[model samples]
Target: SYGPLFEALAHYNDKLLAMAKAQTERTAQALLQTNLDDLGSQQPWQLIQAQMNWWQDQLKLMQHTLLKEQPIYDYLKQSYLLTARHLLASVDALEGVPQKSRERLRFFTRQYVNAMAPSNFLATNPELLKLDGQNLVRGLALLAEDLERSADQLNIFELGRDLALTPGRVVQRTELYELIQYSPTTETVGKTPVLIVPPFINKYYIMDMRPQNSLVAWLVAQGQTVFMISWRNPGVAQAQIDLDDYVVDGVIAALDGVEAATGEREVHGIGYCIGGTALSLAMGWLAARRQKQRVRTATLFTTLLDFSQPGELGIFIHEPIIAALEAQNEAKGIMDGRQLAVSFSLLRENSLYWNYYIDSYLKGQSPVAFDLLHWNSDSTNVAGKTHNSLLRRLYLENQLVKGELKIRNTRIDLGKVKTPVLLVSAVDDHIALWQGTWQGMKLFGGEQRFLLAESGHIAGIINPPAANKYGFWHNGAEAESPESWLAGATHQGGSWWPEMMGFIQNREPVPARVPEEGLAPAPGHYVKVRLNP
Candidate 1:
């Protein structure tokens, strides 16, 4: 019995000692590699400098490890520093690989590593050590509550409470979409109304976030009658919906409503993101049918007609990956919003993933209830057929740009879109890369004006004229490439919204009697009916 007890004791000590030794060596090696300079050549010195500083902090913590509190800090610091260093090294190693494959690998790897950082976990975080034993217990309880909340339902923003506070009414409702017509702020509104088609993937309130930043409110103040299409968050019942349904039932339906609401035959058309693509399809369909005069001017915001260089999103759109997604959707009858949320979050991993990870779990803090983040979290399911067709017909096959795309059994030729076009491209938009947006400039047979806006996708487009935030560039002379356009473009020091309004006003019908009511009030019943809700 004595011998057996001694043997068990030895085994426990050996295993514990091995783990301790391995961890110590790993931390030490990470510190030693500060001067390796393998990644130093490629990355900016500023990034390298931060890595060096972190290593020095590790050394300082090592010296103070005699103190009971310092060991946790040392371990946490070393673990994360090593992870960051390895991530940079892996990306650097991929520099010699083919551009597309390299970018895909790098983006995926970075997203994975960022999400898996030690800072995201409770047991590995240094901040947890600061709490007393009882506080630590309470933190765990809080963390459990958060996890439970997330699992129970969407941990998304509360509409009417957190966002969509704009005052407006639902003028019309159809099987496909709800049209919201805002109460005009001006006594006299333009005869030619403006109809906005927002991306179906998101809610329309992104444009009407708040009174301070609401694009719809701003347009109304400028004496324009604005109508927005709020697409229903799809369900399994809508699995049969396709690209044509979106074009005809959604945009075309809204066009007819805008004309009925205002007697103006010609209305200014605005499309944002995928909505812009759908609007283009509708315009082409109408043009082919010899009714091109329905829309006088076409304004596209961060819309990509060509996918030759679709940026990071292209990584997930390859043949094998899309096929699997298609099959998964076909089986489920809907593309889950939770899955789609992860993909968009990965597009900006550090902010969307790890930041929330640390705040909510490791730090035992609840996320701030912000409007934009809430809207982002409030994702919608896509119909299986709709998503599958978009991936197969547009993304995988590249049919839209090639003139092979068919809407409602009719082929669309984008070159026949004789309506004047206004292209607004953001400089830092990763979703619809500016260069890709620029490729669309030449597709329309009519005159095209390109506005190069400052900032990324959402922020760039939502930039109100009064914010004095980001500026936009306007190139008067037509150019063969985005580079040529940039060379000749004039930098204007303000938001593109005012300039865009001015452009539309030049062609819009003169002031007419304002219409007061629609079918329902603003942020109609459709917008309130979310999948999780």
Candidate 2:
């Protein structure tokens, strides 16, 4: 009798069921305890049949099986899964529900539904059902091996050798960040240098994954003097560092380093995701205090300035959730970056998370050496105070765009920042929706250009010209709404890099300035720091 194997399957199913119930009930408790934001108006007469027509599918299935012998069990399983996901997704449109409540419900539903995928379990999985005599042993071994590797979040790829291979040197290092000046790849360069403020939550090499697709490498090769702000992976010792420190000491300081190293007052400042948010703050601070001489232009990549409808991430960053992590951060002195990584992964459960889980643990397959996935696995820590401020002030309060977000002495006002901007949004980005970033276009002071690229957050960006893969969507100007703009969009072939460069490369051609090699190489010591150690 295979009682042990079947019992394991039942136990796992019950475990998932319990976890789902617990999450939903906790959310209910939290919702009861907190004041719900003004999500929308309530409407009655909503029905499941209005959202989905399951009866048609049932009728179609029955019709199809009239003559030919139906694989009744297989059909039942397929229909069950289809109904599961469809049924779960039906709650996405609901009345009398706050945005957080609906989104949270949808999130947990997806988590449970996806976990119950036929492929995720040994009993339901065809591969597992027909396993060889050695398969169970191999799968168990693989699970143990993977678990061990994941103890420090898996290190299958080397940093300097495989990733962050672009040529550069760290010219300045602070308690919070390192200013890296990439060597000129051309004889002549633009008059204004380019400073990249990468997200503090991850290593900077995401822009320099490889020489071929690397944005920094490509920029240098295109005759742009490039400088990067590499954020240090923080620990308990750096717990006091807040968002203000990152803005003034981190981003603004990087601009100072760029100016000091190049002897130029103005430079093209760029930001990616939360990095863009910091750059916005630095730009805002610079603007608010009549210190706009530092940054000439700003390029925001998949950035979210308006967090009113901050998409999937909004589901998780509610009052109680932040408090839960806040308590943990206070005790630990650092927000565990692994939990952040898990949070993001949870947003895209089936593909980004569960697929790997099933393959590596169940199928006993070796992990692929994907450059992007490797970079993603390289998680970085956030200072406790900084994480608290970000979660509370920005995500929850919606203070940044409202002109209430302050860095130190000056209050941030984007309208005062006259720097021209290029806003790049990836259409399929689950974390920061294109619409959310599109809403941010209205917040700036000067000329704004928006481009909607063809893929998700990472793939749309890191798009090399050589590959010429995903095209971008562009139009004359910002429309009334993102959908209205998209409805009247012009699709351009190739990556958004050249279009981005058009804004900066128009500067006067100046002789490329060489930099004195500093403390360490590109993707310096900071990028090498890990969560485990």
Instruction: Point to the candidate with the largest lDDT.
Output: 2
Local accuracy of candidate 2 as per-residue lDDT tens digits, 426-462: 8778778889898887888888889998877776776
Q: Give the TM-scores of the predictions, in the order they appear.
A: 0.69, 0.70
Error of 2 at 69 (Å): 6.7
TM-score top scorer: 2
Model 1: colliding residue pairs = 168-522, 169-521, 169-522, 170-520, 170-521, 171-519
C-alpha RMSD by candidate, in order: 19.1, 19.8
Q: Count backbone clashes in candidate 1.
A: 6
For each candidate in the order shown, give its overall lDDT on alpha carbons. 0.70, 0.72
